[PDB]
Amino acid sequence: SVRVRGQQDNQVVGQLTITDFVNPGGLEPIGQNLYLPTGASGDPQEGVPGLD
Amino acid sequence: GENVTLGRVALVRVPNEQGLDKKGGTQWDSTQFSGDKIWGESNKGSFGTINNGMLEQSNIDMTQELVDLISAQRNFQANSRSLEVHNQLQQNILQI
Amino acid sequence: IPAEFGKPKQTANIEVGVNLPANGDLKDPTQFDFSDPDTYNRSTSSTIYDSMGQSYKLTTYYLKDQTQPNTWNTYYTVTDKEGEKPLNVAAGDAQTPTGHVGHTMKFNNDGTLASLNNGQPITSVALGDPATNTTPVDMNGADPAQTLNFGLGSATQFAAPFELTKFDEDGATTGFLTKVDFDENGSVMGTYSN
Amino acid sequence: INNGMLEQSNIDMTQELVDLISAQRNFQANSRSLEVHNQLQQNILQI
Amino acid sequence: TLNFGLGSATQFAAPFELTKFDEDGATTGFLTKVDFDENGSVMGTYSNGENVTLGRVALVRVPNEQGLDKKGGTQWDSTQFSGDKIWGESNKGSFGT
Amino acid sequence: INNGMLEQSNIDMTQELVDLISAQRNFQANSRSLEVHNQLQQNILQI
Amino acid sequence: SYVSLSGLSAAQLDLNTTSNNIANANTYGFKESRAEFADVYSNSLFTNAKTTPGGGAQASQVAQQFHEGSSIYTNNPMDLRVSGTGFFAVAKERLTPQQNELTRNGAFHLNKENYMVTANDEFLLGYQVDPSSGEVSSYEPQPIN
Amino acid sequence: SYVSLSGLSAAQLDLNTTSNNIANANTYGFKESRAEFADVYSNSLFTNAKTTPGGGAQASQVAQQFHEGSSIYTNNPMDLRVSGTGFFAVAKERLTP
Amino acid sequence: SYVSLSGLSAAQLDLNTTSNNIANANTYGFKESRAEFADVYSNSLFTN
Amino acid sequence: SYVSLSGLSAAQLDLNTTSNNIANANTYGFKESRAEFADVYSNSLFTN
Secondary structure: OEOOOOOOOOEOOOOOOEEEOOOHHHOEEEEOOEEEOOOOOOOOEEEOEOEO | OOOOOOOEEOEEEOOOOOOOEEEOOOEEEOOOOOOOOEEEOOOOOOOOEEEEOEEEOOOOOHHHHHHHHHHHHHHHHHHHHHHHHHHHHHHHHOOO | OOOOOOOOEOOOEEEEEEEOOOOOOOEOHHHOOOOOHHHOOEEEEEEEEOOOOOEEEEEEEEEEEOOOOOEEEEEEEEEEOOEEEEEOEOOOOEEOOOOOEEEEEEEOOOOOEEEEHHHOOEEEOOOOOOOOOOOOOOOOOOOOOOOOEEEOOOOEOOOOOOEEEEEEEOOEOOOOEEEEEEOOOOOEEEEEOO | OEEOEEEOOOOOHHHHHHHHHHHHHHHHHHHHHHHHHHHHHHHHOOO | OOOOOOOOOOOOOOOOOOOOOOOOOOOOOOOOEEEEOOOOEEEEEOOOOOOEEEEEOOEEEOOOOOOOEEEOOOEEEOOOOOOOOEEEOOOOOOOOO | OOOOOOOOOOOOHHHHHHHHHHHHHHHHHHHHHHHHHHHHHHHHOOO | OHHHHHHHHHHHHHHHHHHHHHHOOOOOOOOOOOEEEEEOOOOOOOOOOOOOOOOOEEEEEEOOOOOOOOEEEOOOOOEEEEEOOOEEEEEOOOOOOOOEEEEOOOEOEEOOOOOEEOOOOOEEEEEEOOOOOOOOOEEEEEEOO | OHHHHHHHHHHHHHHHHHHHHHHOOOOOOOOOOOEEEEEOOOOOOOOOOOOOOOOOEEEEEEOOOOOOOOEEEOOOOOOEEOOOOOOOOOOOOOOOO | OHHHHHHHHHHHHHHHHHHHHHHOOOOOOOOOOOOOOOOOOOOOOOOO | OHHHHHHHHHHHHHHHHHHHHHHOOOOOOOOOOOOOOOOOOOOOOOOO
């Protein structure tokens, strides 16, 4: 959310989603601090950051 | 000899005063966490009264502030000592 | 920890004691109109409460009867957010061509009260019931059948100027959170304006 | 307008002396804080 | 051309005296003080009591300030990762004071 | 132009002393940085 | 070292809060701030939990303790104080009463238009009451004239 | 330090105001001055500012409190005082008013 | 400190009133003045 | 203090008036003088 001048009740501009893995150690490091899912990593499960 | 009321000062109260956002020059504004501004007259309900000829100073205690200064300096020094010990341990490892 | 705590009680009895100026100028009973201050002599404002605890402003208008000496006309109005809606008395003996019904007050030559509403009690019509009043009060979901009893048995008319000597009502709106303290049992106690 | 008179200053010597004391106290406290901040930085500068 | 008025001139026993001299001429102002308001407007007062606004400072805000390229002397310039220069007044919208 | 008066300096001893302290602190920090650079270079030069 | 660095940062935050409190010892309407901290702890399915220490100190919030401050007396009718709960409302622009801010100091004066303003020439807000009215007639906020 | 330095500066400004008031205790027509201060708090779009402290103390304005001063009595008709609201008007040059 | 300053101000106000009374000891038609004081206590939601 | 100084001045003026009256006890045609005083109160928009 961001706050706009002359407007209370800050306006929501997006909603972040994060993904978890059953076996994060099985991810393929592709450099640049990035990972790609693999067969041993498991399916990417997505949701709101704070539930499930 | 015409004594006429020209108005009355507005008094604004928010439910959560801790949540007011801080502007410059000893001023605040209402936000999402502070609730909606409750507009009322003075001396009504939970509102206070308005006294002319007076000002409010700061609500700080020089004794308590000075003691907190001392305690915070002491905590800073202790944490710096901890960091120094850690650096010494790492250097000790790095000399085998 | 509610900011307002209380059990609102609707207004049911309004006891008013006034002194009406005997030296005030006479006024025309049929020309009364609450939008024109010059048709009457005096106007007082009071606050009343409904069943749900909403605050409303009650303005009372006093008019000096010209046709009949030592006689006064009194009208009530209830102020809502749409305007000032006149309040009518069901059995009041003061009537206007505009449909606003007040009550007449008569006084003796020694200044004491003579009669009120031809001896009948002053009970007003329902505030928010459109079936009884041509100007229903918008009570915002509160009890629309609320009625008011007005007591003016101690009103007087002397040479002294207009004076509101006594105003008594049973209304009670709500509290307002004022202080909070916790006892040794962990119970959180709050005191309110009421 | 009145002749034969002059206006003095509109100050109260008592209030001025008291404000002198208060301002000195505030100055001393702030200098103490500045000294504390210098001591912290010196403490870091010796590791 | 000049118009001279001497309708109140007198000749008494008193020595020469210039009792009154009135003219409508007006030369110019002279800059005396400068202050800026919270809107960035520059106000200058002059000898003739002439307080005139001379302009207001321009304020530039780019959407991605991290992407500004660093020149010398504590200066930055717009790039495309920094976005386009948004010209605005102070204390308006998202700008400061 | 006023006769009988002179202009002193336009310096504030308080502000000058505070700026002296701050400049000394900046000098010490920069000297600490140069020391780390020498220490790093010496560390390389001992393989 | 990261935990020690966190401790240093928390101590320095407390120092800055206290110094800001001290500097404003003379300003009118100021409210002291208190800095509160919370522990840092977060373990994975893959760490033993009992064999792993904590994670340092994190800053929770800088509070804005709003207890009543002391009063001075100037014997000047333009100086106002709120004894108890409440804020004044001050508008940046005369016309708009929406863009208003809350304040506690009451150093007011009249400007050339005879409007009650603050030091920054920000117009104070108030209610419109008729010369013969009683309570507030129009409960909307507009600058006091 | 900058916040503490601001506190030092504010205290010294109040000191200077008080000293100026004290010095002019005997001058005719003087009006005392009062120093008023305001807090400093400001933030950009980059900083979070949920857990950031204050920015110190900023001088707001030195007032010119204009409450009536006391009167002395010289028994000389050429000495005048304005009892109440008003100022005397004095012109540097005789010709120009 | 502010409470002590308030006490000083109260004492000085009583002084000024008494001095004005004494000064006008000879004036015709004068009425003396009496200075009365009240306590200060702030009722807030905080501060116990 | 200016109030006290004003009181001193008023008393001294009455003293001078009385002394002038007493000195002229023998002169022919003299008329005594009486000193009358008035209170001072400055009405300003400030000072409550």
